[PDB]
Ligand binder design. Structure first.
Ligand SMILES: CS(=O)(=O)Cc1nc2ccccc2[nH]1
Ligand SMILES: [Zn+2]
Ligand SMILES: [Zn+2]
Ligand SMILES: [Zn+2]
Length: 459
């Protein structure tokens, strides 16, 4: 069992209002055939158009919700909706486009999926809540064949052109008209009771139904994300590198060491309550502080209630010392805290839209994070940038232009002139900091934190 078998049963009950008379006994093999696609007995990397829930999870970056509503069935016009917010109307002859024929519609579909997916995936997985018209309309914009490579590169073929009889990946498809070898999954096969909106609305108040096809496409992908990443968490699935994953993570470790090392020198707390990830290490191992760890896994549903994390009888007195919440999302942080909270609103290739305002951050692993809430930080202030260093002023070993900056907290800057070594480190750390901030991370600290207190650690 590597893939989904074509001889697997397909529950057709969700299809008999668009397709009345549909046989109850149905397989994926018969379904694909009914849809207008001939598989020719090809053993060439595309065993089935439909995929498993496990394969859908491994390729979540490729998910695009898809819904088709009959505006009036090859006689009446159709409204095609995608989780990108696009609405295309096809005539057989939230971006609501007017009625145009299929030969122009398929060109817009290729453009759209390619621009959306080229920096996320090698494929498209159409997430469906199948009623009938979406499966029957695929023959109008989808070509299937053996697995292929791009005509201009080595990435797998995701598009095909009838004008030039060639195949292309998502990056080299300009002008292409057919969606080559797509993937799909039907959420109704996962055994839900009730209609799409009832099931979606049980866990999400952000996506509202309007009746347009794109609203259903959005609710479908959202519901599929909740099922596979909110109420089900598989932290063993690793995801490929598609951006600055290595630098974002490397930057977060440098910023964590820096921010925590300085908080301990500035306010000399006797104890540090490290709340979060059960696999954590002391980010500042040479600190005098008493480091006490408390296990808490990345919540995907709702943010942790600080009342359930602490209270119920551990230092018990968390108000003693400082609390470190590094990516441990709570409802309202205590005033004596240092916090790194990922901002779910951030626009990036690593951040995919999620469920109930949350987002699915995929970087080595998929972490669905609850919606960013500015009110969680009422007892804290934003952490200002600063570079602190106690290291000796010695160059060892890249050209130089004098560094002038107040936020470079070093012995040389105290003594009136930054050395080359610390100026290199300041700019390197400033880029690691800028990297993490733009990736969506936000830093918060107790109101009494003052960098002026770091200068007296040089005597
Ligand atoms: C082989 S198939 O995908 O099942 C049917 C088909 N054959 C095509 C040739 C050109 C364009 C679209 C086409 N759809
Ligand atoms: Zn290519
Ligand atoms: Zn939703
Ligand atoms: Zn120096």
């Amino acid at each position: 069992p590597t893939h989904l078998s074509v001889d697997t049963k397909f529950k057709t009950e969700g299809l008999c209002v668009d397709i009345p008379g549909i046989p109850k006994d149905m397989t994926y093999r018969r379904l694909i055939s009914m849809m207008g696609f001939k598989m020719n007995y090809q053993v060439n990397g595309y065993p089935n158009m439909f995929i498993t829930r496990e394969e859908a999870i491994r390729h979540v970056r490729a998910w695009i919700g898809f819904d088709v509503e009959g505006c009036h069935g090859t006689n009446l016009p159709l409204q095609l909706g995608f989780s990108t917010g696009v609405n295309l109307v096809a005539v057989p002859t939230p971006l609501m486009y007017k009625g145009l024929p299929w030969n122009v519609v398929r060109i817009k579909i290729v453009q759209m999926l390619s621009d959306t997916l080229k920096n996320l995936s090698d494929r498209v997985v159409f997430v469906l809540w199948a009623h009938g018209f979406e499966l029957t309309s695929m023959k109008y914009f989808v070509k299937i064949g053996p697995e292929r490579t791009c005509c201009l590169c080595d990435r797998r073929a995701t598009c095909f052109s009838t004008a030039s009889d060639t195949y292309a990946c998502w990056h080299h498809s300009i002008g292409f008209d057919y969606v080559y070898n797509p993937f799909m999954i039907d959420v109704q096969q996962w055994g839900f009771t009730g209609n799409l909106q009832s099931n979606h609305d049980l866990y999400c108040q952000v996506h509202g139904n309007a009746h347009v096809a794109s609203c259903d496409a959005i609710m479908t992908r959202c519901l599929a994300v909740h099922e596979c990443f909110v109420k089900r968490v598989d932290w063993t699935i690793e995801y490929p590198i598609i951006g600055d994953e290595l630098k974002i993570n490397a930057a977060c470790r440098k910023v964590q060491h820096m921010v925590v090392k300085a908080a301990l020198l500035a306010d000399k707390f006797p104890v540090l309550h490290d709340i979060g990830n059960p696999k954590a290490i002391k980010c500042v191992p040479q600190a005098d502080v008493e480091w006490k760890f408390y296990d808490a896994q990345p919540c995907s549903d709702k943010a942790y209630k600080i009342e359930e994390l602490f209270y119920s009888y551990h230092s018990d007195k968390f108000t003693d010392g400082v609390c470190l919440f590094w990516n441990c999302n709570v409802d309202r942080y205590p005033a004596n805290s240092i916090v790194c909270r990922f901002d779910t609103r951030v626009l990036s290739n690593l951040n995919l839209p999620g469920c109930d305002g949350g987002s699915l951050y995929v970087n080595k692993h998929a972490f669905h994070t609850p919606a960013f809430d500015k009110s969680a930080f009422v007892n804290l202030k934003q952490l200002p940038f600063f570079y602190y260093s106690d290291s000796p002023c010695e160059s060892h070993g890249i050209d130089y232009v004098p560094l002038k900056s107040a936020t470079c907290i070093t012995r040389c800057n105290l003594g009136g002139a930054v050395c080359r070594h610390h100026a290199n480190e300041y700019r390197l750390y400033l880029d690691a900091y800028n990297m993490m901030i733009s990736a969506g991370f936000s830093l918060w600290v107790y109101k009494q934190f003052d960098t002026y207190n770091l200068w007296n650690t040089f005597t």
